[PDB]
Amino acid sequence: MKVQPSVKKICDKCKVIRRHGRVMVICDNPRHKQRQG
Amino acid sequence: SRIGRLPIAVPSGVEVKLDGQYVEVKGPKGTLNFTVREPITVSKNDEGAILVERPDDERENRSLHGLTRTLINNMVIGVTEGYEKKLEIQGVGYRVLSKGPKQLEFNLGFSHPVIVDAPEGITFAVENPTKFSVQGIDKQVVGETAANIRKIRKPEPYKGKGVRYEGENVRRKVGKA
Amino acid sequence: TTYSPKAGEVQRKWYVIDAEDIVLGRLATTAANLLRGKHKPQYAPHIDTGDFVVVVNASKIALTGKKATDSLRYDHSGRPGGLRVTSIGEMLAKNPRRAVERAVWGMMPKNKLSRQQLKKLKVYGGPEHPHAAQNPQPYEITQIAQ
Amino acid sequence: ERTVKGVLGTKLGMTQLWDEHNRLVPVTVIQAGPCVVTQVRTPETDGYSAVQLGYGAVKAKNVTKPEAGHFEKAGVTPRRHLVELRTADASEYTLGQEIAADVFSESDFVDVTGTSKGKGTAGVMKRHGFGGLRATHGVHRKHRSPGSIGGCSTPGKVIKGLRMAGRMGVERVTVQNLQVHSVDAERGIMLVRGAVPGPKGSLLVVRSAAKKAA
Amino acid sequence: GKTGRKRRARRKKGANHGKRPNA
RNA sequence: CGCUGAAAGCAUCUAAGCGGGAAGCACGCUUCAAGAUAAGGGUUCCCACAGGAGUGUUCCUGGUAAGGUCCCCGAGAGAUG
RNA sequence: CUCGAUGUCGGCUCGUCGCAUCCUGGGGCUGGAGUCGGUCCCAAGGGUUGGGCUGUUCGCCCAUUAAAGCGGCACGCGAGCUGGGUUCAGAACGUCGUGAGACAGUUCGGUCCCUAUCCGCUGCGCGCGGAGGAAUCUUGAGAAGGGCUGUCUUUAGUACGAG
RNA sequence: GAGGGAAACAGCCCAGAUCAUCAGCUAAGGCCCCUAAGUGGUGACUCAGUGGGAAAGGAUGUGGAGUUGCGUAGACAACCA
Ligand SMILES: CON(C)Cc1ccc(O)c2c1C[C@H]1C[C@H]3[C@H](N(C)C)C(O)=C(C(N)=O)C(=O)[C@@]3(O)C(O)=C1C2=O
Ligand SMILES: [Mg+2]
Ligand SMILES: [Mg+2]
Ligand SMILES: [Mg+2]
Ligand SMILES: [Mg+2]
Ligand SMILES: [Mg+2]
Ligand SMILES: [Mg+2]
Ligand SMILES: [Mg+2]
Ligand SMILES: [Mg+2]
Ligand SMILES: [Mg+2]
Ligand SMILES: [Mg+2]
Ligand SMILES: [Mg+2]
Numbered sequence: 035m036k037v038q039p040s041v042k043k044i045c046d047k048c049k050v051i052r053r054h055g056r057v058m059v060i061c062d063n064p065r066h067k068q069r070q071g
Numbered sequence: 072s073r074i075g076r077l078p079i080a081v082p083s084g085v086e087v088k089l090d091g092q093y094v095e096v097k098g099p100k101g102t103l104n105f106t107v108r109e110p111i112t113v114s115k116n117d118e119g120a121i122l123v124e125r126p127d128d129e130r131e132n133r134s135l136h137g138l139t140r141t142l143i144n145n146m147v148i149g150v151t152e153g154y155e156k157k158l159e160i161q162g163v164g165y166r167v168l169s170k171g172p173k174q175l176e177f178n179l180g181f182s183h184p185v186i187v188d189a190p191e192g193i194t195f196a197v198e199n200p201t202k203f204s205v206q207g208i209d210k211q212v213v214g215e216t217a218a219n220i221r222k223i224r225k226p227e228p229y230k231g232k233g234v235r236y237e238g239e240n241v242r243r244k245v246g247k248a
Numbered sequence: 249t250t251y252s253p254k255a256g257e258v259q260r261k262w263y264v265i266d267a268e269d270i271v272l273g274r275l276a277t278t279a280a281n282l283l284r285g286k287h288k289p290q291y292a293p294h295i296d297t298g299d300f301v302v303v304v305n306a307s308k309i310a311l312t313g314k315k316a317t318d319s320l321r322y323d324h325s326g327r328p329g330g331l332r333v334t335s336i337g338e339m340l341a342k343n344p345r346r347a348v349e350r351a352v353w354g355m356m357p358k359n360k361l362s363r364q365q366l367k368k369l370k371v372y373g374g375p376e377h378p379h380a381a382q383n384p385q386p387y388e389i390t391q392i393a394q
Numbered sequence: 395e396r397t398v399k400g401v402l403g404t405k406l407g408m409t410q411l412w413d414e415h416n417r418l419v420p421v422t423v424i425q426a427g428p429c430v431v432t433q434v435r436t437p438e439t440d441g442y443s444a445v446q447l448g449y450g451a452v453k454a455k456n457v458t459k460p461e462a463g464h465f466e467k468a469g470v471t472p473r474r475h476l477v478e479l480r481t482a483d484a485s486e487y488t489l490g491q492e493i494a495a496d497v498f499s500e501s502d503f504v505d506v507t508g509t510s511k512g513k514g515t516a517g518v519m520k521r522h523g524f525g526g527l528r529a530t531h532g533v534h535r536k537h538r539s540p541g542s543i544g545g546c547s548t549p550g551k552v553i554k555g556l557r558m559a560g561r562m563g564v565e566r567v568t569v570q571n572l573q574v575h576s577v578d579a580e581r582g583i584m585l586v587r588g589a590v591p592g593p594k595g596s597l598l599v600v601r602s603a604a605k606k607a608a
Numbered sequence: 609g610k611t612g613r614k615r616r617a618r619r620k621k622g623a624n625h626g627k628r629p630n631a
Numbered sequence: 632c633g634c635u636g637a638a639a640g641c642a643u644c645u646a647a648g649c650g651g652g653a654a655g656c657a658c659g660c661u662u663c664a665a666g667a668u669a670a671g672g673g674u675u676c677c678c679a680c681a682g683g684a685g686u687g688u689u690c691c692u693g694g695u696a697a698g699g700u701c702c703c704c705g706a707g708a709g710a711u712g
Numbered sequence: 713c714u715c716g717a718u719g720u721c722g723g724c725u726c727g728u729c730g731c732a733u734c735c736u737g738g739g740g741c742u743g744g745a746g747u748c749g750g751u752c753c754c755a756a757g758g759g760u761u762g763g764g765c766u767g768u769u770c771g772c773c774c775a776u777u778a779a780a781g782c783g784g785c786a787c788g789c790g791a792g793c794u795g796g797g798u799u800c801a802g803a804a805c806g807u808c809g810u811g812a813g814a815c816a817g818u819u820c821g822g823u824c825c826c827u828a829u830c831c832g833c834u835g836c837g838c839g840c841g842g843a844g845g846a847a848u849c850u851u852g853a854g855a856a857g858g859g860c861u862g863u864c865u866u867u868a869g870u871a872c873g874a875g
Numbered sequence: 876g877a878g879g880g881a882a883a884c885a886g887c888c889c890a891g892a893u894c895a896u897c898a899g900c901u902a903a904g905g906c907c908c909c910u911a912a913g914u915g916g917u918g919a920c921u922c923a924g925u926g927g928g929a930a931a932g933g934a935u936g937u938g939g940a941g942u943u944g945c946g947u948a949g950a951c952a953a954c955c956a
């Protein structure tokens with residue numbers, strides 16, 4: 035998982051959600067996992 | 072809540088007691104109980120179905136509407152049919168055997184065999200040394216039990232070895248090309 | 249000359265408040281007012297004219313928002329690394345009397361007389377108190393319109 | 395909450411034995427004498443489960459009327475010492491019951507509690523292991539000094555708990571996991587493999603090992 | 609610095625009217 | 632890392648909820664501790680003294696009980712206490 | 713701000729705190745066969761060696777270690793120590809100046825006091841109170857300490873790998 | 876250059892102390908308790924303890940106001956070729 039202040043969709047399958055007050059990007063490909071921080 | 076606004080059809084032999092905020096569901100397979108969150112109410116709709124109503128079109132009203140609709144439908148479909156989950160193990164040397172409907176023994180390449188106990192509403196059923204299944208009346212409990220069984224040895228991305236879901240799409244790569 | 253109370257001239261009574269589902273802030277403000285006797289026309293800052301307050305069901309005090317796990321209470325022993333911190337929810341579960349006393353003391357003036365008056369607050373986490381002999385009268389937290 | 399067996403005794407001294415592997419073992423000799431249950435504490439009346447034991451030879455003219463009445467209610471002869479044992483099985487103990495060293499077998503692990511030997515006012519170098527200053531190279535009248543005791547204008551103070559000189563010894567010390575070597579109950583002697591706190595003749599509390607064993 | 613930032617931000621209080629000695 | 636699951640007919644560890652999850656947190660182990668003036672609790676012992684003033688007895692003197700101290704012999708204690 | 717004095721480098725002693733984590737603990741992604749790694753999330757409980765050179769900090773090196781962390785505290789700590797460096801008067805060299813002399817150039821030598829009043833802190837007593845006076849045994853609100861880690865054996869030459 | 880406000884706080888805000896007063900009205904600032912006066916009335920917004928510090932940048936947070944494409948010729952999802 036990448037922890038970055040700037041999280042964006044990288045592929046077309048990545049989905050942006052707000053989990054527990056934090057913006058996250060979830061994707062089938064594990065490389066695209068992201069979390070704001 | 073497009074899901075919530077759809078009704079819930081009570082099947083034959085299923086007893087649905089709406090005791091205000093607290094609800095009982097009896098059926099052939101067992102008994103389930105649930106409390107709906109307060110700003111959501113449940114009606115019988117001529118005693119042959121179930122309806123859930125959001126008192127306002129806000130966010131929490133609609134969210135709890137859909138949640139409660141899906142969860143009540145889940146309990147009724149469970150008490151009328153149950154919940155089944157198939158888990159298959161791959162990789163040489165890995166085996167599963169049963170000491171009863173609620174007791175599993177796994178040899179997942181560990182130093183020693185590992186023992187798995189089941190909750191009261193969970194019953195195992197093994198048919199093959201490399202395939203088995205879990206059944207119950209609560210979807211959440213069945214799912215979490217399957218998740219724990221998988222967590223015992225999750226599939227790998229090199230030879231798949233590990234407990235995997237029946238339809239699980241396990242990722243894979245190649246190290247020593 | 250303005251009136252001034254004389255020692256034991258003002259008769260101190262006993263009230264009991266059921267903290268059942270009552271916000272901690274309202275409970276503490278009401279308790280401080282009663283303990284200092286601000287509801288009496290005979291009030292005087294320099295003479296204790298307040299009443300005894302028995303708080304019951306302090307374990308069921310209502311908290312709004314995420315206070316039960318994010319509103320923290322700190323103590324320091326006075327030596328390096330001597331801080332302990334516990335959330336108000338844990339403190340209400342374990343030692344509700346300490347939580348209510350901390351709130352009321354914070355809301356009460358910083359005085360020797362205030363320290364003396366805070367002893368008049370008897371806080372119990374359960375629904376039962378041992379002061380039946382003192383015969384506390386029920387007190388209802390209310391508001392006066394406009 | 396924990397069930398503990400216990401007995402009271404006196405530190406008689408030490409000697410040495412040879413075990414079955416021909417190993418030299420230091421043993422403390424404890425006169426784990428007869429103890430009598432003077433009082434049993436129950437949650438109903440006292441709020442916790444514990445057993446008060448007696449033990450000790452006392453002169454009849456040195457036992458006062460309150461103590462004499464306490465022992466008379468206990469139904470036993472007066473004893474010099476009285477020590478409680480926090481056990482969760484206190485009930486199984488009856489008033490005036492007899493307790494002897496045979497409460498411990500030949501290989502039980504025990505915890506021995508006693509008051510350590512006193513040393514008076516000790517320096518930092520002795521009571522805290524402070525390394526002092528050098529003996530030469532210009533050290534000026536501070537060979538056993540504690541060095542610095544703080545910082546500077548911040549915090550312009552000495553932090554609480556700083557280790558400095560003071561009176562060392564005479565304190566409750568429990569030494570754990572000592573394997574009882576032998577028990578001879580007919581004369582009340584216990585041989586415990588190890589060294590226990592306190593001077594010869596001090597009172598010792600021998601309890602079952604809290605951590606069971608190593 | 610934190611101290612300087614707090615000193616500058618103290619001027620935002622109600623009774624002061626956006627001004628304060630030493631900013 | 633999850634389970635169930637909407638808002639958003641799907642999905643989603645989350646919005647309702649539940650589970651795992653570190654030498655860290657709080658316990659467990661050891662020690663101090665009711666000046667904790669909130670001054671605690673158990674058990675046991677001693678007992679309704681005397682004489683004055685008095686202004687509800689109040690309060691002040693005096694001899695004691697249970698008990699303790701001083702003094703003396705010491706150390707397992709200790710600068711002195 | 714301090715010139716009717718706030719003593720200035722390094723070591724010694726004693727610590728304490730931060731986490732921007734060196735080791736140990738946990739987890740993701742890996743460009744993660746295994747073995748290992750490298751990233752960056754958690755995490756400050758404990759631990760974090762002895763020497764050669766130099767007044768040194770720094771730095772290099774030797775031998776280890778699970779590791780030899782980075783910083784704050786008047787670049788912590790001289791009414792605690794050290795005086796080797798720095799920054800007094802002596803002297804010499806180089807350079808500069810006609811000269812007296814000068815030099816963040818170098819070299820050898822070179823005085824550093826304090827019986828603790830207050831707070832602070834480590835210990836130890838006396839008093840009074842604890843609604844009668846005592847003797848014994850205690851509860852624990854709360855406080856403190858403690859918390860490190862290696863190697864080998866076995867699982868097993870098992871899993872993995874073409875070896 | 877006192878008094879009131881700004882937690883404290885020469886330079887900011889209110890206001891220039893002739894003395895007395897156990898009278899009244901106000902300024903700035905305030906009215907749950909500390910702390911004098913409203914846990915004021917009515918309508919919205921926030922759920923971050925934001926309020927009660929901060930940037931480039933980032934984000935299906937949430938309310939409101941537009942413009943515009945498509946849509947019971949049947950839209951967007953979900954489900955069979
Ligand atoms: C190496 O740098 N360090 C820090 C300085 C220092 C170091 C060690 C010392 O031993 C002395 C000094 C300073 C000098 C100051 C002289 C001065 N005088 C020469 C004008 C003076 O003013 C007086 C006085 N009575 O006031 C003195 O004391 C004095 O003569 C003297 O002796 C001194 C010393 O002792
Ligand atoms: Mg030495
Ligand atoms: Mg000397
Ligand atoms: Mg100071
Ligand atoms: Mg800066
Ligand atoms: Mg999902
Ligand atoms: Mg999922
Ligand atoms: Mg001066
Ligand atoms: Mg961190
Ligand atoms: Mg450290
Ligand atoms: Mg910490
Ligand atoms: Mg260097």
Ligand SMILES: [Mg+2]
């Ligand atoms: Mg440091």
Ligand SMILES: [Mg+2]
Binds near residue numbers: 787
């Ligand atoms: Mg310095």
Ligand SMILES: [Mg+2]
């Ligand atoms: Mg100093």
Ligand SMILES: [Mg+2]
């Ligand atoms: Mg020198």
Ligand SMILES: [Mg+2]
Binds near residue numbers: 798
């Ligand atoms: Mg010098």
Ligand SMILES: [Mg+2]
């Ligand atoms: Mg020459």
Ligand SMILES: [Mg+2]
């Ligand atoms: Mg010349």
Ligand SMILES: [Mg+2]
């Ligand atoms: Mg020199």
Ligand SMILES: [Mg+2]
């Ligand atoms: Mg001195």
Ligand SMILES: [Mg+2]
Binds near residue numbers: 852854
């Ligand atoms: Mg405690």
Ligand SMILES: [Mg+2]
């Ligand atoms: Mg205290």
Ligand SMILES: [Mg+2]
Binds near residue numbers: 876
């Ligand atoms: Mg002027």
Ligand SMILES: [Mg+2]
Binds near residue numbers: 876
């Ligand atoms: Mg002014």
Ligand SMILES: [Mg+2]
């Ligand atoms: Mg002012």
Ligand SMILES: [Mg+2]
């Ligand atoms: Mg002021």
Ligand SMILES: [Mg+2]
């Ligand atoms: Mg007015």
